[PDB]
Design an enzyme around this catalytic site. Structure first.
Site, PDB file in Angstrom:
ATOM      1  CB  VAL A   1       5.028   7.321  -0.282  1.00  0.00           C
ATOM      2  CG1 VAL A   1       5.311   8.751   0.029  1.00  0.00           C
ATOM      3  CG2 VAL A   1       5.975   6.830  -1.361  1.00  0.00           C
TER       4      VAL A   1
ATOM      5  N   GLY B   1       0.825  -1.188   0.000  1.00  0.00           N
ATOM      6  CA  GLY B   1       0.000   0.000   0.000  1.00  0.00           C
ATOM      7  C   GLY B   1       0.864   1.244   0.000  1.00  0.00           C
ATOM      8  CG  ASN B   2      -0.353   4.735  -1.796  1.00  0.00           C
ATOM      9  OD1 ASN B   2      -0.889   5.789  -1.475  1.00  0.00           O
ATOM     10  ND2 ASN B   2      -0.912   3.875  -2.638  1.00  0.00           N
ATOM     11  NE  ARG B   3       4.062   5.292   5.341  1.00  0.00           N
ATOM     12  CZ  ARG B   3       3.794   4.464   6.341  1.00  0.00           C
ATOM     13  NH1 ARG B   3       2.716   4.660   7.088  1.00  0.00           N
ATOM     14  NH2 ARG B   3       4.596   3.436   6.582  1.00  0.00           N
TER      15      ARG B   3
END
Ligand SMILES: Nc1ccn([C@@H]2O[C@H](COP(=O)(O)OP(=O)(O)OP(=O)(O)O)[C@@H](O)[C@H]2O)c(=O)n1
Ligand SMILES: Nc1ccn([C@@H]2O[C@H](COP(=O)(O)OP(=O)(O)OP(=O)(O)O)[C@@H](O)[C@H]2O)c(=O)n1
Ligand SMILES: O=C(O)C(=O)c1cn(-c2ccc(O)cc2)c2ccc(-c3ccccc3)cc12
Ligand SMILES: O=C(O)C(=O)c1cn(-c2ccc(O)cc2)c2ccc(-c3ccccc3)cc12
Ligand SMILES: [Ca+2]
Ligand SMILES: [Ca+2]
Lengths: 209, 214
Positions: free
Chosen positions: B23, A27-29
């Site tokens: 990220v 995933g990513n933030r």
């Protein structure tokens, strides 16, 4: 006032999750809050908004907005191909995962040497739309807006040129780049204030056409 | 009504996230809801609860509960090592990542190399050993969590029992009636489905029960 009245807009927001198996993923933030903000401001200014949402389950659905829920970057692509022909404006605010696991285990993975995760590139949804419109497949498309996180302007204008979209919102340091050679800076303010500067730029671009 | 009064409880909940760069990360789908519900039910019955929380479904800090937010599995381990000498009860409800990336970029990553992995420590097992080695004199109950199923390698109960035996905790709370409460004495109790609040009560009731036998 209501400058986007009657405008059909399609928006993507959030980060995608690329399954490794049924429970784990990459995933990513990206929160997607900025993407929700544009959809909200668009619905607020009269647009007929459809929102494709990634890893944003704890956000409030924006009012007046048709919601489309996806999981992986590929599911996002399918949803964009499905809804893009009806849109006049496409806003790609999702942090779409650049790569995905080459293999997805159908069961949860479980003692000696760790494996590596081979990766495969996901499709570029923004380029594919830019290409579809250039191939005459998106006659309704009046505006395609991309996002980039990044001399930022060196990378930003180069990325705007490579994507071929109409506007690039970079860092949303933050800038609004037009393919017209217009460069504007995004005053680092609220997500609402930046969502207003983007739709200001979109309505503006739509009028020049 | 206040059976955990004066009990210091250390709770972990949610899933960890193992960074590749600032990220991107490797995560899982754990919501943390059952772990928070146990923390909430513990504090309401008088415990001094500390909640170490990773990624949750956007859950609200419970009131009267001391919060510690962590990201990766290594940060969860450090947070547990720091607070465990003071805890009487350890509830490991977190989905701790078993592996993490071999390299982390301090900046984002614009063909692709595969992701090499290194194993994370078993935080719950280390707690069981430390107590068995006398390093956690205050620790009276160590509770683990498991989500188990039945497969070509055995029925859900077989896998569940094997997990209790390999981990060595006092209680294993197994989801799969909703699941099981397996005790280190060989006691097994189905977990009837209810709300996360109600199931947190059957759990803390089981913990209180074990603490009384201890
Ligand atoms: N598979 C992808 C990846 C990105 N994008 C879109 O294109 C823009 C790219 O954002 P960026 O983070 O710069 O992704 P990349 O173009 O791959 O650039 P880089 O990997 O160097 O960060 C965003 O609007 C994103 O929504 C997309 O549609 N499909
Ligand atoms: N690196 C890890 C992995 C798991 N756990 C803890 O151990 C318990 C069992 O987790 P589980 O993943 O079910 O055990 P594993 O041995 O990792 O399971 P499997 O072998 O089935 O993957 C959970 O309470 C979890 O908090 C832990 O502390 N540290
Ligand atoms: O082996 C285990 O017991 C085991 O838990 C894992 C094995 N993988 C894995 C190895 C190689 C690969 O290509 C794909 C996957 C994992 C990946 C992620 C996690 C995880 C991450 C965050 C939160 C909770 C769990 C846990 C495991
Ligand atoms: O708190 C939560 O709801 C959460 O996220 C959970 C994470 N795990 C978990 C997953 C994989 C793993 O390897 C280690 C731990 C859980 C295991 C069991 C339960 C549970 C138990 C009884 C009743 C209902 C749910 C809830 C969780
Ligand atoms: Ca990217
Ligand atoms: Ca596991």
């Amino acid at each position: 006032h209501h400058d986007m009245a009657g405008v059909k807009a399609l928006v993507t927001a959030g980060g995608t999750r690329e399954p490794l198996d049924p429970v784990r993923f990459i995933g990513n933030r990206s929160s997607g809050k900025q993407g929700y903000a544009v959809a909200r401001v668009l619905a607020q200014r009269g647009a007929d908004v459809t929102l494709i949402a990634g890893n944003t389950a704890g956000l409030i659905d924006p009012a007046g907005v048709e919601m489309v829920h996806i999981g992986s970057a590929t599911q996002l692509r399918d949803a964009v191909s499905k809804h893009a022909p009806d849109a006049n404006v496409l806003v790609m605010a999702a942090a779409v995962a650049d790569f995905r696991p080459a293999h997805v285990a159908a069961a949860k993975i479980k003692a000696s040497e760790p494996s590596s995760i081979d990766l495969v590139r996901n499709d570029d949804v923004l380029a594919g739309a830019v290409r579809a419109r250039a191939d005459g497949q998106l006659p309704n498309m009046r505006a395609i807006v991309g996002f980039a996180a990044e001399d930022v302007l060196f990378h930003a204008r180069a990325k705007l040129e490579r994507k071929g979209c109409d506007l690039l919102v970079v860092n949303a340091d933050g800038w609004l780049l037009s393919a017209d050679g217009t460069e504007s800076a995004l005053e680092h303010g609220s997500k609402t204030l930046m969502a207003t500067r983007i739709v200001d730029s979109i309505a503006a671009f739509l009028k020049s056409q």
